Design a binder for these strands. Structure first.
Length: 1033
RNA sequence: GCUAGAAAUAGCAAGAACUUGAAAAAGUGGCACCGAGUCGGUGCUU
């Protein structure tokens, strides 16, 4: 019936789930192929695909290659020729002297009314089509997406959004006056750095601006990388270099560099448009002409000066060509930087060299027309020049009038290539590109499974990479530098009387204690250093208005009753008393401008419609561009119908969600996530994403434009927010007065005063009268879904493509010679095929095997076995094929939800980060159910006895658990979480218990696989083909 | 390209599995309900 798909895209896993209207996951019967007696299996429509990174055919197909680009461009030229064909069917010296560069021809064709030869017109059009420019800016050129100021603000906004801890606030800066000024790149960089006292040229932001100006910054110090990663936007090989860089540090910084590129284009766009002589001209071509003219002037001046003053070495400049001279610059293989390095001392020595040096320092002296800068030209400019030329030559050529929109669409449409090329064009690491391809294939298979019925909704989450612990110190270092700078600026030696290190500053209440100068925020009294348990953590902006649990919106105080009776920010009576202390904490860079604004928001009226809209946009809109591109790919592949007009019929809505929504949903209703148990949590996150997405699109359809990707009817702030909290409640079409979007999930709403508001048991849409949430059946359903033990975890088997390396193994049945008599004995062996041997084997397998020493091979039974091939043995125990002589664990430990929640609460004991009432009730819940620990150990034991089969390790960990049974529950739960690594899917890894270290238990024997059941799994695992290998022989 | 010279050589100018296919590529895996130890059972219907 009606359904929706939830997706959790990551770098090592892709979670997927299908939900119905009642938020249930269907369980269906699937056919089982092969030659066994099992012909049907019942499977739950929920799972997660796993795929380790590596060298694969698919991977190379998704990499950018010169050849694919080349054929693309060639195709475009072919189309252009096809457009000119039907009418075409019905000088060198002159050209070069009249137009010494193509930009002369272009500017003439845009600014000349005279009739031109059609061949030159074709040359111009082909040059504009072949190198059409980037598509990072969407739509027509306008100051909103073109001026340097707005894009610089957008860059620092993206920066602060990506970090928010120690962010940069830039309001006084005049980005236009600094970046657009006519000076050298390095001097512009230093001039911008001078306006930011907290950042330096070698910092991350400094390196980003340097990258945007056209320099070659080094990002090793910003990310501590082992290998040097240099980036230059103008260089043609920047994209794959960025893809390498992003692969090292993750794709979260991808959008950052994208904004940097945009800033570069903006600076260039202001640098090119500055020489705007006439309003109706062609700025790019005219500027290239001016560059040519300056080149010509400087050239003739150089020859004059050289001939008069320096007769010697003229041949070295214009005749030798072997040492990168001017003759080498024009006729030889000498780059612009080499020519500058060669001609710098000649200009330094000579007299009468004024004016040439100010151009030399600005890197605009004797420039060529084919240089590294043309990659930055947007396509809207070429579209403008094309429109101008078409308008000038409209009456002369009728087919330009007839095919104007055709040519324009060919240049602007993004022709339509393959899906592999669309994924290859993306800006990200090969991992997320692989994941995107896998996601598309997963969607295709899922809609195939549902009788070719497309879902109503496809909810997308970009799964976050949990902390790798190398970053667990970086955050502590940044907050530590903030504390040290604030203390040194103020002058209160709290660190002298109470020394602390960056390790202890991870605690929320201690970090807030040091952020607040060891003083109460609301009262003029010193805080007790060793009585923080009695102290409460208050939210500057209540949770009823906005879900912000960062340090930016948190304070530490002895009692949260001091904020007063209002549900808003703390009252003016406290602000008036503490304004001096808050202004000293403000000017000491202990807090940001926004935090001071929120603390002092009652002085400027209180919450406003603009503030609530800003909160909604902060919570509901996704800033990451990569997510929008994934949604674009899925939307284009899923939605392809139209109507009579040129309007796209959107049958499937692609909803984009933030991780904070699902995380807070788990934390608020105790649907806790523990990644260490098994790999099911990806699928579970996908399911909860589907639930949350469907709930938001059903409750607030008019807010689709905020999350759903597409071109929808725009909206404002008046129709959304009610005048009064209660006096307009349930009597207007306004959806919500409180700015937190996730309130409709809650049954009750606790405000900042303590009054507990009640909401109906059944949530329905106001306009259409459709039930959107049943607060009873749906929570029971969610818990039931999280309790299901059968979740489809599939490891993508891949042939390796790129101490020899085995591409894949093969199952061979034949006979061999044994003993002195050379008697033939039938054998079945696992042979490893090297990457080199793969071609020869696929060319002629039998001859290869006969050369290897096998006799009488059965060609039909030769079975290809890539890495991670799954085999099943007795009692459902499963093993994956790692190599020709080693196996990996193939089972997933399914743990009941009650034990998962108990384990989370035991581990998250000190870091609950919640209200005291529920925190104490959770503590009592953990303490009362200590027996659950023994129960959990029993679970792993039975599970281990069934599928792991490691008696020695099990005895060791059982004994080690028996020695430390009386230890506290927190550390005990942590050591059980560590102990779960023994049963984790994949390769055995060494893990640490309380004082024990359990070494890996390798599986060196491989003979049993030869008589097990090989299970060929589809990408989702719903479709299985099971081959009983014991029957082959 | 311009001037000389038998040349050589000199002066100048200027800008997963399976099926079909060679391949790209097309195809192959029923619907509800009660449960839930890696999925089981029942009804309908191929």
């Amino acid at each position: 019936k009606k359904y929706s798909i939830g997706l959790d895209i990551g770098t090592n896993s892709v979670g997927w789930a299908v939900i119905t209207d009642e938020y249930k996951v269907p369980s269906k019967k699937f056919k089982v192929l092969g030659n066994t007696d099992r012909h049907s299996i019942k499977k739950n429509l929920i799972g997660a695909l796993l795929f380790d990174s590596g060298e694969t055919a698919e991977a190379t197909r998704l990499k950018r290659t010169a050849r694919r680009r080349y054929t693309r461009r060639k195709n475009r030229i072919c189309y252009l020729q096809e457009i000119f064909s039907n009418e075409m069917a019905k000088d060198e010296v002159a050209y070069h002297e009249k137009y010494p560069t193509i930009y002369h021809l272009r500017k003439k064709l845009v600014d000349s009314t005279d009739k031109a030869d059609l061949r030159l017109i074709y040359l111009a059009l082909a040059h504009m089509i072949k190198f059409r420019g980037h598509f990072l800016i969407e739509g027509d050129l306008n100051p909103d997406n073109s001026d340097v100021d707005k894009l610089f603000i957008q860059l620092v906004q993206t920066y602060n959004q990506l970090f928010e801890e120690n962010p940069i606030n830039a309001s006084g800066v005049d980005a236009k006056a600094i970046l657009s000024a006519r000076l050298s790149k390095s001097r512009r960089l230093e001039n911008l750095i001078a306006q930011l006292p907290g950042e330096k040229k070698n910092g991350l932001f400094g390196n980003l601006i340097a990258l945007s100006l056209g320099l070659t910054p080094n990002f090793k110090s910003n990310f501590d990388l082992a290998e040097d990663a240099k980036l230059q936007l103008s260089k043609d090989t920047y994209d794959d270099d960025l893809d390498n860089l992003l692969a090292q540090i993750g794709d979260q910084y991808a959008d950052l560099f994208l904004a940097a590129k945009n800033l570069s284009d903006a600076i260039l766009l202001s640098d090119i448009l500055r020489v705007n002589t006439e309003i109706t001209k062609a700025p790019l071509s005219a500027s290239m002409i001016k560059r040519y003219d300056e080149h010509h002037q400087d050239l003739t001046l150089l020859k004059a000066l050289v001939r008069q003053q320096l007769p010697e070495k003229y041949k070295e400049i214009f005749f030798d060509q072997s040492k990168n001279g001017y003759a080498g610059y024009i006729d030889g293989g000498a780059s612009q930087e080499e020519f500058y390095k060669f001609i710098k001392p000649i200009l330094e020595k000579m007299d009468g060299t004024e004016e040439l040096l100010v151009k030399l320092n600005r890197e605009d002296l004797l420039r060529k027309q084919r240089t590294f800068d043309n990659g930055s030209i947007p396509h809207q400019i070429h579209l403008g020049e094309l429109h101008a030329i078409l308008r000038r030559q409209e009456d002369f050529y009728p087919f330009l009038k007839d095919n104007r929109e055709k040519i324009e669409k060919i240049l602007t449409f993004r022709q339509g290539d393959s899906l592999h090329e669309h994924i290859a064009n993306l800006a990200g690491s090969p991992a997320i590109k692989k994941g995107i391809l896998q996601t598309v294939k997963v969607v295709d298979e899922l809609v195939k499974v549902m009788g070719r019925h497309k879902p109503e909704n496809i909810v997308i989450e970009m799964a976050r990479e949990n902390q790798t612990t190398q970053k667990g110190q970086k955050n502590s270092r940044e907050r530590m530098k903030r504390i040290e700078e604030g203390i040194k600026e103020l002058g209160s030696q709290i660190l002298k009387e109470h020394p602390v290190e960056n390790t202890q500053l991870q605690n929320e209440k201690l970090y807030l204690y040091y952020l607040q100068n060891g003083r109460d925020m609301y009262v003029d009294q010193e805080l007790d250093i060793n009585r923080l348990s009695d102290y409460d953590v208050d939210h500057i902006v209540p949770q009823s208005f906005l879900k912000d649990d960062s340090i930016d919106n948190k304070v530490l105080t002895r009692s949260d009753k001091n904020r007063g009776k209002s549900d808003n920010v703390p009252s003016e009576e406290v602000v008036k008393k503490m304004k001096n202390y808050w202004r000293q904490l403000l000017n000491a860079k202990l807090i940001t401008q926004r935090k001071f604004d929120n603390l002092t928001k009652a002085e400027r009226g209180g919450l406003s419609e603009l503030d609530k809209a800003g909160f909604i946009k902060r919570q509901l809109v996704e800033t990451r561009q990569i997510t929008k591109h994934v949604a674009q790919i899925l939307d284009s592949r899923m939605n392809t119908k139209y109507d009579e007009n040129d309007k796209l019929i959107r049958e499937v809505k692609v909803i984009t969600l933030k991780s904070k929504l699902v995380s807070d949903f788990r934390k608020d209703f105790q649907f806790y996530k523990v990644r260490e148990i098994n790999n099911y949590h990806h699928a579970h996150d996908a399911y909860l994403n589907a639930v949350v997405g469907t709930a938001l699109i059903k409750k607030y359809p008019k807010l689709e434009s905020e999350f759903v990707y597409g071109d929808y009817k725009v909206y404002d702030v008046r129709k959304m927010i009610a005048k009064s909290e209660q006096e307009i409640g349930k009597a207007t079409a306004k959806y919500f007065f409180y700015s937190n979007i996730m309130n409709f999930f809650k049954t009750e709403i606790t405000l900042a005063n303590g009054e507990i508001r009640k909401r109906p048991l059944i949530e329905t849409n106001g306009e259409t009268g459709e039930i959107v949430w049943d607060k009873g059946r749906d929570f029971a359903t969610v818990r039931k879904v999280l309790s299901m033990p059968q979740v489809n975890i599939v490891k993508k088997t891949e042939v390796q493509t790129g101490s020899p390396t085995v591409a894949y193994s093969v199952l061979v049945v034949a006979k061999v010679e044994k003993g002195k008599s050379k008697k033939l004995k039938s054998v079945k062996e696992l042979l490893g095929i090297t990457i080199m041997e793969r071609s020869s084997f696929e060319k002629n397998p039998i001859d290869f095997l006969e050369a290897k020493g096998y006799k009488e091979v059965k060609k039909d039974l030769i079975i290809k076995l890539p890495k991670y091939s799954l085999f099943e043995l007795e009692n459902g125990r499963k093993r994956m094929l790692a190599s020709a002589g080693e196996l990996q664990k193939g089972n997933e430990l399914a743990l009941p939800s009650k034990y998962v929640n108990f384990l989370y609460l035991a581990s998250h004991y000190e870091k609950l980060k919640g209200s005291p009432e529920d925190n104490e009730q959770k503590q009592l819940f953990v303490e009362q159910h200590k027996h659950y620990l023994d129960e959990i150990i029993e679970q792993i034991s039975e599970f281990s006895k069934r599928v792991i089969l490691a008696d020695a390790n099990l005895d060791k960990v059982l004994s080690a658990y028996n020695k430390h049974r009386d230890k506290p529950i927190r550390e005990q739960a942590e050591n059980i979480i560590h102990l779960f690594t023994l049963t984790n899917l994949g390769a055995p890894a060494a893990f640490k218990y309380f004082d024990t270290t359990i070494d890996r238990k390798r599986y060196t024997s491989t003979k049993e696989v030869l008589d097990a059941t090989l299970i060929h799994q589809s990408i989702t695992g719903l479709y299985e083909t099971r081959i009983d290998l014991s029957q082959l022989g």
